Short mmCIF file of all heavy atoms in Angstrom, two decimals:
data_model
loop_
_atom_site.label_atom_id
_atom_site.label_comp_id
_atom_site.label_asym_id
_atom_site.label_seq_id
_atom_site.Cartn_x
_atom_site.Cartn_y
_atom_site.Cartn_z
N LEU L 862 -5.21 -22.06 -3.73
CA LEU L 862 -5.79 -21.65 -2.46
C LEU L 862 -6.32 -20.22 -2.52
O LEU L 862 -7.38 -19.93 -1.95
CB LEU L 862 -4.76 -21.78 -1.34
CG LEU L 862 -5.21 -21.26 0.02
CD1 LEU L 862 -6.46 -21.98 0.47
CD2 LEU L 862 -4.12 -21.43 1.04
N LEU L 863 -5.61 -19.32 -3.18
CA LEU L 863 -5.98 -17.91 -3.24
C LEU L 863 -6.71 -17.63 -4.55
O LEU L 863 -6.18 -17.88 -5.63
CB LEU L 863 -4.75 -17.03 -3.14
CG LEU L 863 -4.19 -16.77 -1.75
CD1 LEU L 863 -2.96 -15.91 -1.84
CD2 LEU L 863 -5.23 -16.11 -0.89
N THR L 864 -7.92 -17.08 -4.44
CA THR L 864 -8.65 -16.70 -5.63
C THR L 864 -8.09 -15.41 -6.20
O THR L 864 -7.29 -14.72 -5.57
CB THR L 864 -10.13 -16.54 -5.33
OG1 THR L 864 -10.29 -15.71 -4.18
CG2 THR L 864 -10.76 -17.87 -5.05
N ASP L 865 -8.51 -15.08 -7.42
CA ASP L 865 -8.01 -13.87 -8.06
C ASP L 865 -8.46 -12.61 -7.35
O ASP L 865 -7.74 -11.61 -7.35
CB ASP L 865 -8.45 -13.83 -9.52
CG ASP L 865 -7.90 -14.99 -10.30
OD1 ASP L 865 -6.71 -15.31 -10.13
OD2 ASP L 865 -8.66 -15.59 -11.09
N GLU L 866 -9.65 -12.64 -6.74
CA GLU L 866 -10.11 -11.47 -6.00
C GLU L 866 -9.18 -11.17 -4.83
O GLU L 866 -8.91 -10.00 -4.54
CB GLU L 866 -11.53 -11.71 -5.50
CG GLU L 866 -12.57 -11.57 -6.58
CD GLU L 866 -12.62 -12.77 -7.50
OE1 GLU L 866 -11.91 -13.76 -7.22
OE2 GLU L 866 -13.36 -12.73 -8.50
N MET L 867 -8.69 -12.20 -4.16
CA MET L 867 -7.77 -11.96 -3.06
C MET L 867 -6.46 -11.37 -3.55
O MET L 867 -5.89 -10.48 -2.90
CB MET L 867 -7.54 -13.26 -2.30
CG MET L 867 -8.80 -13.79 -1.66
SD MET L 867 -8.78 -15.57 -1.41
CE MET L 867 -9.55 -15.66 0.20
N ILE L 868 -5.96 -11.84 -4.69
CA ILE L 868 -4.74 -11.27 -5.25
C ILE L 868 -4.97 -9.80 -5.58
O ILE L 868 -4.10 -8.95 -5.33
CB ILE L 868 -4.30 -12.05 -6.49
CG1 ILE L 868 -4.26 -13.55 -6.20
CG2 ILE L 868 -2.95 -11.59 -6.94
CD1 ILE L 868 -3.21 -13.93 -5.24
N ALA L 869 -6.13 -9.48 -6.15
CA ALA L 869 -6.44 -8.09 -6.45
C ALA L 869 -6.50 -7.25 -5.18
O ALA L 869 -6.06 -6.10 -5.17
CB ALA L 869 -7.76 -8.01 -7.21
N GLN L 870 -7.05 -7.81 -4.10
CA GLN L 870 -7.10 -7.07 -2.85
C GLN L 870 -5.71 -6.78 -2.31
O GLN L 870 -5.44 -5.67 -1.85
CB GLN L 870 -7.92 -7.84 -1.82
CG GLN L 870 -9.40 -7.77 -2.05
CD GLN L 870 -10.18 -8.26 -0.87
OE1 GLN L 870 -9.85 -7.96 0.28
NE2 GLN L 870 -11.23 -9.04 -1.13
N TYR L 871 -4.82 -7.77 -2.35
CA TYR L 871 -3.44 -7.53 -1.94
C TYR L 871 -2.78 -6.45 -2.78
O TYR L 871 -2.10 -5.56 -2.24
CB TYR L 871 -2.64 -8.82 -2.01
CG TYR L 871 -2.84 -9.74 -0.85
CD1 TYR L 871 -2.51 -11.07 -0.94
CD2 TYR L 871 -3.36 -9.27 0.33
CE1 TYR L 871 -2.68 -11.91 0.13
CE2 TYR L 871 -3.53 -10.10 1.40
CZ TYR L 871 -3.19 -11.42 1.29
OH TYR L 871 -3.37 -12.26 2.37
N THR L 872 -2.94 -6.52 -4.09
CA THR L 872 -2.33 -5.52 -4.95
C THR L 872 -2.86 -4.13 -4.64
O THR L 872 -2.10 -3.16 -4.56
CB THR L 872 -2.58 -5.88 -6.41
OG1 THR L 872 -1.80 -7.03 -6.74
CG2 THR L 872 -2.18 -4.74 -7.30
N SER L 873 -4.17 -4.02 -4.45
CA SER L 873 -4.76 -2.73 -4.12
C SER L 873 -4.24 -2.21 -2.80
O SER L 873 -3.98 -1.00 -2.65
CB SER L 873 -6.28 -2.86 -4.07
OG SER L 873 -6.84 -1.73 -3.44
N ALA L 874 -4.08 -3.08 -1.81
CA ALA L 874 -3.57 -2.65 -0.52
C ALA L 874 -2.15 -2.11 -0.64
O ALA L 874 -1.83 -1.05 -0.08
CB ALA L 874 -3.61 -3.80 0.48
N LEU L 875 -1.29 -2.81 -1.38
CA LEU L 875 0.07 -2.32 -1.58
C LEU L 875 0.07 -0.97 -2.28
O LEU L 875 0.82 -0.06 -1.89
CB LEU L 875 0.89 -3.33 -2.37
CG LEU L 875 1.23 -4.62 -1.65
CD1 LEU L 875 1.63 -5.68 -2.63
CD2 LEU L 875 2.37 -4.35 -0.71
N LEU L 876 -0.75 -0.82 -3.31
CA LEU L 876 -0.78 0.43 -4.05
C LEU L 876 -1.23 1.58 -3.17
O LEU L 876 -0.63 2.66 -3.17
CB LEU L 876 -1.70 0.29 -5.26
CG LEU L 876 -1.27 1.08 -6.48
CD1 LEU L 876 0.05 0.57 -6.95
CD2 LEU L 876 -2.31 0.90 -7.55
N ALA L 877 -2.30 1.37 -2.40
CA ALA L 877 -2.79 2.44 -1.53
C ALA L 877 -1.76 2.80 -0.48
O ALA L 877 -1.54 3.98 -0.19
CB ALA L 877 -4.10 2.01 -0.88
N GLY L 878 -1.10 1.80 0.10
CA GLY L 878 -0.11 2.08 1.11
C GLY L 878 1.05 2.90 0.58
O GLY L 878 1.48 3.87 1.20
N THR L 879 1.56 2.53 -0.60
CA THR L 879 2.70 3.28 -1.12
C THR L 879 2.31 4.66 -1.61
O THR L 879 3.11 5.59 -1.53
CB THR L 879 3.39 2.51 -2.24
OG1 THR L 879 4.50 3.28 -2.72
CG2 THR L 879 2.46 2.27 -3.39
N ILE L 880 1.09 4.84 -2.11
CA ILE L 880 0.68 6.17 -2.54
C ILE L 880 0.47 7.08 -1.34
O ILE L 880 0.82 8.26 -1.38
CB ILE L 880 -0.58 6.08 -3.41
CG1 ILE L 880 -0.20 5.71 -4.83
CG2 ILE L 880 -1.30 7.40 -3.43
CD1 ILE L 880 -1.37 5.28 -5.64
N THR L 881 -0.09 6.56 -0.26
CA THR L 881 -0.47 7.43 0.84
C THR L 881 0.64 7.65 1.86
O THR L 881 0.75 8.74 2.42
CB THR L 881 -1.70 6.87 1.55
OG1 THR L 881 -2.64 6.44 0.57
CG2 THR L 881 -2.32 7.94 2.37
N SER L 882 1.46 6.64 2.14
CA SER L 882 2.39 6.72 3.26
C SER L 882 3.86 6.59 2.88
O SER L 882 4.70 6.49 3.77
CB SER L 882 2.07 5.64 4.29
OG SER L 882 2.00 4.38 3.66
N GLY L 883 4.19 6.58 1.60
CA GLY L 883 5.60 6.47 1.24
C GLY L 883 6.13 5.08 1.51
O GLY L 883 5.48 4.08 1.20
N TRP L 884 7.33 5.01 2.07
CA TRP L 884 7.92 3.73 2.44
C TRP L 884 7.78 3.41 3.91
O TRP L 884 8.32 2.40 4.36
CB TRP L 884 9.40 3.69 2.06
CG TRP L 884 10.22 4.75 2.71
CD1 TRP L 884 10.57 4.81 4.01
CD2 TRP L 884 10.88 5.84 2.06
NE1 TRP L 884 11.36 5.91 4.24
CE2 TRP L 884 11.57 6.55 3.05
CE3 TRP L 884 10.93 6.29 0.74
CZ2 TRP L 884 12.31 7.69 2.77
CZ3 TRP L 884 11.66 7.42 0.46
CH2 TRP L 884 12.34 8.11 1.47
N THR L 885 7.10 4.25 4.68
CA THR L 885 7.01 4.02 6.12
C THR L 885 6.24 2.74 6.43
O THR L 885 6.63 1.99 7.33
CB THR L 885 6.34 5.21 6.78
OG1 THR L 885 4.97 5.24 6.41
CG2 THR L 885 7.00 6.48 6.33
N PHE L 886 5.16 2.48 5.71
CA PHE L 886 4.28 1.38 6.08
C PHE L 886 4.96 0.03 5.98
O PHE L 886 4.46 -0.94 6.55
CB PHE L 886 3.03 1.39 5.20
CG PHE L 886 3.22 0.74 3.87
CD1 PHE L 886 2.74 -0.53 3.63
CD2 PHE L 886 3.87 1.40 2.86
CE1 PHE L 886 2.92 -1.12 2.42
CE2 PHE L 886 4.04 0.81 1.64
CZ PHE L 886 3.57 -0.45 1.42
N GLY L 887 6.08 -0.05 5.28
CA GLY L 887 6.79 -1.30 5.21
C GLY L 887 7.70 -1.59 6.37
O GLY L 887 8.36 -2.63 6.39
N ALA L 888 7.76 -0.70 7.35
CA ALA L 888 8.66 -0.88 8.49
C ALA L 888 7.97 -0.52 9.80
O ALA L 888 8.63 -0.03 10.72
CB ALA L 888 9.92 -0.05 8.32
N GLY L 889 6.67 -0.75 9.90
CA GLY L 889 5.94 -0.40 11.09
C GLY L 889 4.52 0.03 10.79
O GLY L 889 3.78 -0.70 10.14
N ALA L 890 4.14 1.21 11.26
CA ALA L 890 2.81 1.74 11.03
C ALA L 890 2.86 2.81 9.95
O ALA L 890 3.77 3.64 9.93
CB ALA L 890 2.24 2.33 12.32
N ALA L 891 1.87 2.79 9.06
CA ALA L 891 1.83 3.76 7.98
C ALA L 891 1.70 5.17 8.53
O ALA L 891 0.89 5.43 9.43
CB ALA L 891 0.66 3.45 7.05
N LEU L 892 2.49 6.08 7.99
CA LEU L 892 2.47 7.48 8.36
C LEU L 892 2.06 8.31 7.16
O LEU L 892 2.67 8.20 6.09
CB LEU L 892 3.83 7.94 8.87
CG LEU L 892 4.45 7.10 9.99
CD1 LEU L 892 5.65 7.79 10.57
CD2 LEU L 892 3.43 6.86 11.05
N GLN L 893 1.04 9.13 7.33
CA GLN L 893 0.57 10.00 6.25
C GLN L 893 1.65 10.99 5.83
O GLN L 893 2.45 11.44 6.64
CB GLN L 893 -0.66 10.73 6.73
CG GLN L 893 -0.48 11.17 8.15
CD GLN L 893 -1.69 11.79 8.75
OE1 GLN L 893 -2.65 12.08 8.06
NE2 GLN L 893 -1.68 11.96 10.06
N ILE L 894 1.66 11.32 4.54
CA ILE L 894 2.61 12.25 3.94
C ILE L 894 2.04 12.75 2.62
O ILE L 894 1.59 11.94 1.80
CB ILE L 894 3.99 11.60 3.77
CG1 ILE L 894 5.06 12.62 3.39
CG2 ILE L 894 3.95 10.46 2.78
CD1 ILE L 894 5.37 13.60 4.43
N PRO L 895 1.98 14.06 2.39
CA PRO L 895 1.49 14.54 1.10
C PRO L 895 2.40 14.10 -0.03
O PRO L 895 3.62 14.02 0.13
CB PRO L 895 1.49 16.07 1.27
CG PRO L 895 2.24 16.33 2.50
CD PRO L 895 2.15 15.14 3.36
N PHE L 896 1.80 13.83 -1.19
CA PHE L 896 2.52 13.12 -2.24
C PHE L 896 3.70 13.92 -2.78
O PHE L 896 4.76 13.35 -3.06
CB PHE L 896 1.57 12.76 -3.37
CG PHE L 896 2.13 11.76 -4.32
CD1 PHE L 896 2.13 10.42 -4.01
CD2 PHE L 896 2.66 12.15 -5.52
CE1 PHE L 896 2.64 9.50 -4.88
CE2 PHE L 896 3.18 11.23 -6.38
CZ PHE L 896 3.17 9.91 -6.06
N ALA L 897 3.53 15.23 -2.96
CA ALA L 897 4.60 16.02 -3.53
C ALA L 897 5.83 15.99 -2.63
O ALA L 897 6.96 15.91 -3.12
CB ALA L 897 4.14 17.45 -3.75
N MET L 898 5.64 16.04 -1.32
CA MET L 898 6.77 15.96 -0.41
C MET L 898 7.44 14.59 -0.49
O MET L 898 8.67 14.49 -0.36
CB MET L 898 6.31 16.26 1.01
CG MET L 898 5.47 17.51 1.09
SD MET L 898 5.30 18.10 2.77
CE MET L 898 6.99 18.03 3.31
N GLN L 899 6.66 13.54 -0.70
CA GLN L 899 7.26 12.23 -0.88
C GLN L 899 8.13 12.19 -2.13
O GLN L 899 9.23 11.64 -2.12
CB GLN L 899 6.18 11.16 -0.95
CG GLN L 899 6.71 9.78 -1.21
CD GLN L 899 5.62 8.80 -1.48
OE1 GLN L 899 5.83 7.78 -2.12
NE2 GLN L 899 4.44 9.08 -0.97
#
């Protein structure tokens, strides 16, 4: 059902979320945070 492009999009979304917002985005709305502080 899911093409490889869709899998790549999901992977990219997870990567961007964890790089930009830490672990917040997994429990509500993503909150910005500079990487060094994370």
Side-chain angles (χ1 to χ4, degrees):
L862 175 58
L863 279 178
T864 50
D865 298 316
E866 284 76 6
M867 296 155 140
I868 310 293
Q870 284 193 41
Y871 280 161
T872 290
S873 165
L875 290 162
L876 214 63
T879 180
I880 279 166
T881 316
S882 52
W884 59 72
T885 69
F886 82 103
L892 308 190
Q893 41 186 349
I894 191 66
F896 194 80
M898 311 195 48
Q899 177 189 155

